[PDB]
Amino acid sequence: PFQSTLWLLVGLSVHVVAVMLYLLDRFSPLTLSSAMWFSWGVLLNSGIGEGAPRSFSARILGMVWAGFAMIIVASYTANLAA
């Protein structure tokens, strides 16, 4: 039911947003690879999880990403209902 138009951007959406965490860690008052697993984990409802953002602002980026997980997969499994 999901067209390839949305697939490409959402697939690349996680990659371009995970890097901002380590970028934000530069001026904080955990390598880049060790921080990217978090975002892909959030969406996939996975059981693998370790390491959390340390800076206060980095949590906000992780915070807003949490809401994106709930809206997509739940609504995606609502279109199939019809």
Binding site: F27, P29, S57
Partner: peptide, 19 residues
């Protein structure tokens, strides 16, 4: 507005860090 909210809060800790 996510990063826009992040960048404006990015300098918020800079104020505490620099003062």
């Amino acid at each position: 507005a996510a990063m826009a909210l992040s960048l404006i809060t990015f300098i918020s800790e800079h104020l505490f860090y620099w003062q």
